[PDB]
Amino acid sequence: PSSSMADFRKFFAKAKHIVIISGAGVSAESGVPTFRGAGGYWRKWQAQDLATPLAFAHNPSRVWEFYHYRREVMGSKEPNAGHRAIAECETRLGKQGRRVVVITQNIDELHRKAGTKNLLEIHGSLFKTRCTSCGVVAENYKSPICPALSGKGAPEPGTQDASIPVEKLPRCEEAGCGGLLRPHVVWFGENLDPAILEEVDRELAHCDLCLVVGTSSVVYPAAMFAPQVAARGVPVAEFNTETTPATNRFRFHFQGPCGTTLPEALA
């Protein structure tokens, strides 16, 4: 792949429909750990061992402790230069009749906070619940989400489980339902929303430039989106602190923190 910023910017000048795919690396500079770097451990586990319906089936208190911790940490976090460059790019191009869409694997909502409008949150949101009984999806920013979680979620190895009885975890308040809530987050082994996937496929099929930013490109189906676009002959530029298994499929690779490279690229 080319590291020519000038060649990328020639495509960027002409592009009518840009898809920006992001992962946890785009939020690293807001002081939010990635999943596979740092930093990624919560007590003894990584996200892949907790973000699963089997963890939730057999220890919903532990899974809730993890998501609670993340919710409370994320409340104080701010968009960084990469999130702003992405939002500002969308705004500026929109006034020219040019489309920019963000397809994010992040559930942190920082793209929303940055000012991105055309946002596809393909793994859900830290700040939404879904009821395991009635299926209702609700926005939830309550701190703490339920009283039993107050002061819980401490991330240090050696921290004891809160072991909250299931009745005292977050419960559904729709129509007296009372059902156990889960995070409205896509877990390993679970299907992404088919309606979201249909929107993604239409953006990928019609875009004429693609950036893939801060993702390890190992989680599917997301990891195949930018390669799909590249394989149509459309230029794809990867922005990452390192190379990934997808790097060689792409037209461009810009190594470095995306809070530096994205403002330059999208200027």
Added chain:
Amino acid sequence: TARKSTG
């Protein structure tokens, strides 16, 4: 294809 996996 629609399942979150690694992949």
